[PDB]
Structure 1
Amino acid sequence: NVHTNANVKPKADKSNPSHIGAQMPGSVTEVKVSVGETVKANQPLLITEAMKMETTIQAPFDGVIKQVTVNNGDTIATGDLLIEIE
């Protein structure tokens, strides 16, 4: 806890269906799931904030969250891996 948003996420593999990457830069407002939870297609996973606008990130299909890369109030660049699902 000297850097909190100065951790570096890896980059999503664009050609991996289970990698969800950030679509633009901004802010994690609220992580809504843990490594291990099962989810349904279209479930709230993540609320981000872009430039004063809230976007909700959803499950693409049904499955199992395998890694969650961010914490409330971390910052993100286009392309950052946010979640793995199966």
Structure 2
Amino acid sequence: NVHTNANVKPKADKSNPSHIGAQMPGSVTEVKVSVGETVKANQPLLITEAMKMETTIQAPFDGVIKQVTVNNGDTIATGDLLIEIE
């Protein structure tokens, strides 16, 4: 592509605790976890930039990251799947 800004992300299924969805339209500023990792509850796994403002996305529980749908500097839309955990 030349970067990954054209990439369409699947929508997170809302009634599945494994699926973490994008809460706002933002930009992925920093990816912090990869496929097959295990960190504690509240682990800062993704850093988005909403609109000049920055929030870390945290894990709701303990578990193993199955998929990360995004890369650094990627645009996101409300309801976009970002992370899946076990």
TM-score w.r.t. length of structure 1: 0.96
1:38-85 Cα offsets, whole Å, 9 max, x none, are 121100000000110001000110000000000000000000000000
Q: Once the two structures are aligned, what percentage of the paired residues are identical?
A: 100
Q: State how far apart, in whole Å, the 2-side matches of 1:47 and 1:39 are.
A: 16
Q: State how far apart, in whole Å, the 1-side matches of 2:54 and 2:3 are.
A: 25
3-12 vs 62-71, which deviates more?
A: 3-12
Distance apart, 1:3 and its partner CA: 5.8
User: What SS does the aligned partner of 1:83 have?
Assistant: strand
1:67 match: 67
Distance apart, 1:30 and its partner CA: 0.4
Distance apart, 1:16 and its partner CA: 0.4
Q: State how far apart, in whole Å, the 1-side matches of 2:9 and 2:59 are.
A: 20
Q: CA RMSD in A?
A: 0.9
**How many corresponding residue pairs?**
86
Distance apart, 1:5 and its partner CA: 1.0
Which residues of structure 2 form unaligned runs of 5+?
none
